[PDB]
Design a protein around this ligand. Structure first.
Ligand SMILES: CN(C)c1ccc(C(N)c2ccc(N(C)C)cc2)cc1
Ligand SMILES: [Ca+2]
Ligand SMILES: [Ca+2]
Length: 279
């Protein structure tokens, strides 16, 4: 399959070179996989999700995404137009308030929730969790991410947006999950992207067009936008049977575009997520 005039990020993950505008992907499109987006919620009624999204848990008064961030991330995972895995199903877990903030205890609860909840869902091709959030180092936040990964879920987390070593941020600093840095359309490390030896992979993160609340769309930037590209790609690869939840981060790194990125500090991986699609 091919999507013409795709958002640049989608094109980039299906090309060995920057500058292309077509997203090439297998028609299976992540069907049979499930991705939990742990964030400010998801506007499930957005036409772009085609009824494939639903809220399963909130830690606040409502399950509504009153912010937009969660809906944007979910759109990059699995919306029709802006999504990597266009037939996956999406589950929203609202651990962040409508200001985009949340306490560590709530975030931890949301991760434990997913580890249990996945046992009540029909996801024959596997389960992914996308965490576009983070804060200062916390061993208990890292431990919750490690548990989620251990339980059989492919955990993708944002590196953070402080142009600093991700070792001082959580859950980015948890080695057992897949920590994702951001790149721009010219194959440079995004100016805000964290870096460091704990990074596993880079994905498109600068000027990412996706779904927004009120049935709208907008372009925003962050390692928050890179993470759902990798989460979507994981779901896509699991559906194809190329990898499992336990080994998906390693498979993505193994099959990545290598050495294409500029402005990568010594000690940080030069690896950009790539779907290896061959028609
Ligand atoms: C410091 N830390 C762990 C962290 C910081 C920022 C973010 C992030 N999602 C973010 C930060 C800034 C902005 N802007 C627009 C300033 C957007 C997203 C995530 C983690
Ligand atoms: Ca290349
Ligand atoms: Ca890792």
């Amino acid at each position: 399959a091919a999507q013409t005039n795709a958002p640049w990020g989608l094109a980039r993950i299906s090309s060995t070179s920057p500058g292309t505008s077509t997203y090439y992907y297998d028609e299976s499109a992540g069907q049979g996989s499930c991705v939990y987006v742990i964030d400010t919620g998801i506007e499930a009624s957005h036409p772009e999700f085609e009824g494939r999204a639903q809220m399963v848990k909130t830690y606040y008064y409502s399950s509504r995404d009153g912010n937009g961030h969660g809906t944007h991330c979910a759109g990059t995972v699995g919306s029709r137009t802006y999504g990597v895995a266009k037939k996956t199903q999406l589950f929203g877990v609202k651990v962040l308030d409508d200001n985009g903030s949340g306490q560590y205890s709530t975030i931890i609860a949301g991760m434990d929730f997913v580890a249990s909840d996945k046992n009540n869902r029909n996801c024959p091709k596997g389960v992914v969790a996308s965490l576009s959030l983070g804060g200062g180092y916390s061993s208990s936040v890292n431990s919750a991410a490690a548990r989620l990964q251990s339980s059989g879920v492919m955990v993708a987390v944002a590196a953070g947006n402080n142009n600093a070593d991700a070792r001082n941020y959580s859950p980015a600093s948890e080695p057992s999950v897949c920590t994702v840095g951001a790149s721009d359309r010219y194959d440079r490390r995004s100016s805000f992207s964290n870096y460091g030896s704990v990074l596993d992979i880079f994905g498109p993160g600068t000027d990412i067009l996706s779904t927004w609340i009120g049935g709208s769309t907008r372009s925003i930037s962050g390692t928050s936008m890179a993470t759902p590209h990798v989460a979507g790609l994981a779901a896509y690869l699991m559906t194809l049977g190329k990898t499992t939840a336990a080994s998906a981060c390693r498979y993505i790194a193994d099959t990545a575009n290598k050495g294409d990125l500029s402005n990568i500090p010594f000690g940080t991986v030069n690896l950009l997520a790539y779907n290896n699609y061959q028609a």
